[PDB]
Amino acid sequence: RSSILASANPIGSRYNPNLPVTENIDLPPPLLSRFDLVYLVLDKVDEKNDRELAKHLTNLYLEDKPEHISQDDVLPVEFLTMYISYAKEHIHPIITEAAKTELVRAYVGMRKMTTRQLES
């Protein structure tokens, strides 16, 4: 009982925009429906995005510690592990009647545009 976090890749190492998702990747159709979130991170050529991304990576190599970022904006690794282990042993959310009504309406609207998407 564990989650699977993998990263797929296309055949020719280039996601063609004029090709379907099932044809670009050699993954079985049943394997694609078993996942919960199928993100598609593309490498779009943008001048406004490559300029800000290069400045962020250059600031990490100039200073070993983020002095420009405040301490209340980035949480340490020791505090992040204590927030997940504590909530996974005491916090137990219960689906109420108002929350269960919107989940049924959202599942019908998605099919009008499998049962694995309902549990996700």
């Binding site: 280039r14 490498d43 990576l57």
Partner: protein, 115 residues
């Protein structure tokens, strides 16, 4: 095109940084200057230009009439009128370095073809 290479992946951007930082170690310098960036970018352009031939031609030294035509394009960009009375373009040519005798011959040449 026929010489379709790879896409501009972000990994190629980090390669120029590693090549520029390695060039500063040979010169015993703790800071990367502008010469180290140009030297690292030259090695990438050489490996990419190995498919093209050694035939490069470049020529850009014609009559000075083309330089005066660029000043007329600035007036048409802000306004866009082809009138004969031009009193503001003459003040821009004098600040450049051209004489007033050659300016009158360029305006009459363009006015004949209605430009």
């Amino acid at each position: 095109s026929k010489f379709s290479f790879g896409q501009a992946t972000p990994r190629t951007l980090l390669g120029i940084i590693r090549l520029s930082q390695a060039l500063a170690k040979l010169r015993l310098a703790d800071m990367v200057d502008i010469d180290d960036v140009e030297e690292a970018l030259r090695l990438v352009r050489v490996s990419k230009e190995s498919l093209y031939q050694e035939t490069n031609k470049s020529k850009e030294d014609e009559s000075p009439t083309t330089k005066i035509f660029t000043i007329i394009k600035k007036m048409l960009q802000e306004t866009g009128k082809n009138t004969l009375s031009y009193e503001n373009i003459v003040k821009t040519v004098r600040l450049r370095g051209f004489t007033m005798l050659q300016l009158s011959n360029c305006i009459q040449e363009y006015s004949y073809l209605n430009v």
